[PDB]
Design a binder for this molecule. Structure first.
Ligand SMILES: [Zn+2]
Ligand SMILES: [Zn+2]
Lengths: 98, 56, 196, 122, 71, 98, 167, 56, 98
């Protein structure tokens, strides 16, 4: 379509550091029956940990993106029902402006 | 379509087209009509050859 | 990153509700046949049962999923030690050339560098890949329980477009690999290829 | 697992070896020696028509979902006129189109069905 | 439930790429690696998951532990 | 500045878009009675939600290069539009000034 | 339908019932295996009334023996609405099970009026259960459940699914 | 002409109202599934029939 | 930058117009630096010859120099294209279409 664009890709390491600094507990310390309600934050399909307060993390990530601290092409999705927070930074994703 | 709230079964949200061609189509009706037209075109393309094979 | 380690991983549910759907098996890269999930979990360091169920099912109250998992444990009870599971996997791999350690090294290599490659080069794989495989099996069971619908291929968000960048990237990767191999052939062939 | 049943010292999985002489159902780790007596006659349940998972996914902030629809049905036990509703989350074909609601100020699930209550108290 | 199979594993005291047989009694979970040239047997246990490839290879591991032949 | 996004097909599953800025006015949500009953205009569905997250920059940006040169494509039927999009690449004209 | 029965309604329904294929799995809610050494009573108050109903009928029969009595209960709870829809009673399903299990499964019946459509079954194993409720392997009961829910044709013609009567 | 456009609009509105009533009945579990079809298929069949009648 | 090496041995800056008229590929050379680390034979009897560290001790690295890997075809208006920075007054000076 006219306004459609295709992502070219970005390094996920800065976003992973952001996530870690913002309370993303690593998998190695994860125990399902101690934090059953925790989400599953991950980037590019690599389960990177779990966050117990997804709403605040999502607000921070959106604010950083809209501020430019995160490349705008970086796509993030929160599945409130499935308790999963997803992020994609690779190339080939077709997106649109809104 | 991402302009409707989840779990909506209303006629407008599932392909119904209230307007006429004289009156026009709203963007959602336009897209649904495009869906239907694409279905028709694919069917025609398939028949073009399947019917010929049956003929032979 | 460029190697792309492209090797499909499949977790399969067999038979049907009144048949081999009791058990679950997975396919590993460069392995002759599939293996049950529980042996793989024990090979990754999750020895006791329950803990494997901790990894797979994330809510003990979800009794249906543990019911579905019953036969996996009923079949994996035979193996109890990590090296035993590694021996099992490596032996299933290929011919028993490594008679000394019973192909332990082969199984370790496969599960470290070819099993779920998008996480690799890290001894923490033992836990990370185990958790991800648990997630895989959880999704499989959720679909099998009709909790979630079958995944749709047509979803345009599940697709990617290879524009000029990636296409030229893979083409140039192949050509550069050929060039480097030719340079190595000239090195090996010609003594003092250094200067030439 | 309708209940919790694991060896306390091995965490392995127990299976029903009934004790014939005592006529008591007994459990003991196959690879260990710990021995535990059955605490309930239930050992197996296969549920064909299920009333589980209909409301799966209700979380502490389901209301924050923008996509879900909102209505004004009065919360039965709160009288709040705001809630967010949805249909059953199980994907069995024969599932009814009954609606499930959620009181945004109470986390209480009420259904539109005229003959059955919420999943937890249907 | 009795399984006997010839496969590609070599014949050790007997030097042949295809001369390796076996017997597998699953009722008693017992069996033996049977050498159609070098002969006698290699008795040991069987596991419910013991596929004939697993039979051959694990029992061959046991053979090296004993430094015997393939049957 | 945080005024527009880049929404991917995967992210647009979690959002609620408004077709046009007029869909946001409180009047449509509340004012059910109005004198603009011109029977010559498209029947547009009323204001249905209030949790909008984004708004379309404009419809008709869902069209491609060959489609967006059709006058009144929403008064045709889709097969005609596809035929025109295919046959607009055969129209004789000046492809370059040089 | 035959010329003398075509013009009518309920006879068409009777033909429909005679043709349409229906099994226990179409009317069963859930199947549960319970531990209950007592062959004449139960530790479950819920099934006590049903057992008492047949305690005066079945356990009062001549030549009482425990060869058909086991400590395992294969309790199937049926669907009243489904049975009503198919015009099925506890009778029909019971004697179909008997046909498939002439003497290999002792079967107890729940009264049709009861809100709990229950088929209380016990394993049968002569020479071991003759005077004891020995702990039969549960896998035997699971296989029995498979046979009941798959290989039992309550009524109809095999390979004939829903039959739609129309005018 | 205007009068027939208003009549068409009233026809479509009546069809929409009938579809809404069927939706309310189905969501209240009071709808009875047509024999040979589960609840959802019966509801969809009724809705599509009403909309087609409206168009005709 | 894009260039053409004539049959006479003289390299000449190549522009898209000439490339199209003369049937020349529009491409630019790929020069890379190649470190050259040489470990002369140590000839040290014992475990020294089994150790590559002793060979490292014989390290003798020479100048690398830019080595011509090949030619990468370049798409027009890209960052490396001659027309990327050209303005309108230059676009038709190069006989290219604005
Ligand atoms: Zn134990
Ligand atoms: Zn309330």
């Amino acid at each position: 379509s006219l306004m459609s664009c295709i992502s070219v890709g970005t390094d996920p390491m800065p976003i992973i550091t952001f996530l870690s600094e913002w309370g993303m507990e690593p998998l190695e310390d994860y125990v399902p029956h101690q934090s059953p309600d925790a989400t599953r934050v991950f980037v590019n399909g690599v389960w990177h940990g779990v966050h117990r307060n997804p709403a605040r993390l999502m607000e921070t990530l959106r604010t950083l993106r809209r501020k430019g601290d995160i490349n705008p092409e970086v796509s993030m999705i929160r599945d409130i029902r499935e308790k999963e927070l997803k992020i994609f930074t690779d190339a080939g994703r077709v997106y649109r402006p809104l | 379509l991402p302009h409707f709230s989840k779990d909506d079964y209303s006629p407008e949200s599932k392909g119904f087209v209230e307007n006429s061609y004289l009156r026009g189509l709203t963007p959602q009706e336009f897209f649904f009509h495009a869906m239907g037209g694409r279905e028709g075109l694919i069917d025609t393309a398939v028949k073009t050859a399947e019917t010929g094979y049956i003929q032979r | 990153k460029g190697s792309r380690f492209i090797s499909t991983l499949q977790v399969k549910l067999y038979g049907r509700e009144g048949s081999s759907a009791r058990t679950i098996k997975a396919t590993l890269p460069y392995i002759k046949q599939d293996i049950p999930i529980v042996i793989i979990f024990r090979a990754l360091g999750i020895i006791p049962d329950g803990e494997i169920l901790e990894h797979i099912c994330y809510d003990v109250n979800d009794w249906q999923m543990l019911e579905m998992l019953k036969p996996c444990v009923e079949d994996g009870f035979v193996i109890q030690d990590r090296e035993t599971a590694l021996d099992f996997i490596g032996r299933r791999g290929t011919a028993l050339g490594i008679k000394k350690e019973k192909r332990i090294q082969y199984a370790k290599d496969i599960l470290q560098k070819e099993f779920l490659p998008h996480i690799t080069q890290l001894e923490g794989f033992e836990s990370r890949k185990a958790f991800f495989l648990g997630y895989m099996i959880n999704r499989l069971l959720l679909c099998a329980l009709d909790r979630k619908d079958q995944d749709d291929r047509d979803h345009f968000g599940k697709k990617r477009l290879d524009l000029a960048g990636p296409l030229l990237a893979q083409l140039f990767k192949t050509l550069f690999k050929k060039l480097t191999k030719d340079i190595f052939r000239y090195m090996q062939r010609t003594v003092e290829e250094a200067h030439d | 697992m309708t209940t919790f049943r694991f060896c306390r010292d091995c965490n392995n999985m127990l299976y029903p070896r009934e004790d014939k002489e005592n006529n008591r159902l007994l459990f003991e780790c196959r690879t260990c020696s710990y021995v535990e007596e059955a605490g309930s006659p239930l050992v197996y349940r296969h549920e064909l028509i299920t009333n589980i998972g209909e409301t799966a996914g209700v979380v502490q902030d389901i209301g924050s979902d923008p996509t879900l629809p909102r209505s004004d049905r009065e919360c039965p036990k709160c009288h709040s006129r705001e809630n967010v509703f949805f249909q059953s989350q199980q994907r069995r074909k024969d599932t009814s189109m009954v609606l499930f609601f959620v009181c945004l100020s109470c986390s209480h699930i009420f259904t539109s069905d005229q003959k059955n209550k919420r999943t937890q108290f249907s | 439930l009795v399984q006997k199979l010839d496969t590609k594993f070599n014949c050790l005291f007997c030097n042949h790429e295809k001369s390796v047989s076996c017997t597998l009694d699953k009722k008693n979970s017992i069996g033996t690696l049977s050498c159609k040239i070098c002969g006698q047997s290699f008795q040991t246990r069987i596991n419910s998951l013991s596929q004939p490839v697993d039979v051959y290879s694990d029992w061959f591991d046991a053979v090296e532990e004993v430094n015997s032949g393939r049957g | 500045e945080g005024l527009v996004e880049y929404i991917d097909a995967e992210e647009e599953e979690s959002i609620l878009i408004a077709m046009q800025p007029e869909d946001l006015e409180p009047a449509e949500a509340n004012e059910e009675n109005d004198l603009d009953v011109d029977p010559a205009k498209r029947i547009r569905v009323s204001h249905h939600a209030t949790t909008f997250t984004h708004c379309e920059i404009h419809p008709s940006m869902i069209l491609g290069v060959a489609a967006s040169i059709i006058p009144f494509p929403d008064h045709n039927q889709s097969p005609r539009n596809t035929y025109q999009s295919a046959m607009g690449k055969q129209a004789m004209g000046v492809f370059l000034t040089n | 339908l035959e010329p003398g029965h075509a013009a009518d309604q309920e006879q068409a329904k009777l033909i429909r019932s005679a043709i349409e294929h229906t099994t226990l799995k179409s009317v069963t809610i859930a199947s549960e295996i319970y531990y209950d050494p007592d062959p004449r009573s139960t530790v479950i108050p819920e099934d006590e009334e049903i057992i008492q109903l047949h305690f005066s009928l079945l356990d009062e029969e001549a030549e009482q023996s425990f060869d058909q009595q086991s400590p395992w209960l294969l309790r199937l709870e049926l669907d009243r609405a489904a049975m009503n829809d198919k015009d099925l009673t506890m009778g029909q399903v019971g004697e179909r099970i008997k046909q498939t299990f002439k003497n290999d499964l002792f079967v107890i019946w729940s009264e049709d009026n009861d809100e709990k459509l229950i088929i209380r079954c016990r394993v049968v194993r002569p020479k071991s259960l003759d005077a004891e409720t020995e702990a039969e392997e549960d896998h035997m009961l699971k296989k029995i459940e498979n046979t009941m829910l798959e290989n039992i044709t309550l009524r109809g013609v095999e390979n004939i699914e829903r039959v739609v009567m129309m005018k | 002409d205007g009068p027939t456009m208003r009549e068409i609009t009233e026809t479509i509105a009546e069809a929409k109202k009938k579809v809404l009533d069927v939706t309310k009945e189905a969501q209240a579990n009071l709808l009875t599934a047509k024999h040979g079809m589960t609840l959802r298929e019966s509801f969809e069949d009724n809705v599509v029939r009403f909309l087609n009648e409206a168009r005709d | 930058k894009p260039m053409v090496n004539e049959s006479d041995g003289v390299t000449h800056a190549l522009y898209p117009q000439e490339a199209r008229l003369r049937n020349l590929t529009y491409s630019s050379g790929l020069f890379v630096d190649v470190k050259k680390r040489t470990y002369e034979a140590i000839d040290v009897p014992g475990r020294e010859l089994k150790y590559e560290l002793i060979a490292e001790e014989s390290e003798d690295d020479s100048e690398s120099g830019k080595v011509f890997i090949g030619r990468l075809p370049i798409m027009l208006r890209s960052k490396n294209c001659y027309l990327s920075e050209a303005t309108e007054s230059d676009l038709y000076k190069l006989k290219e279409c604005p």
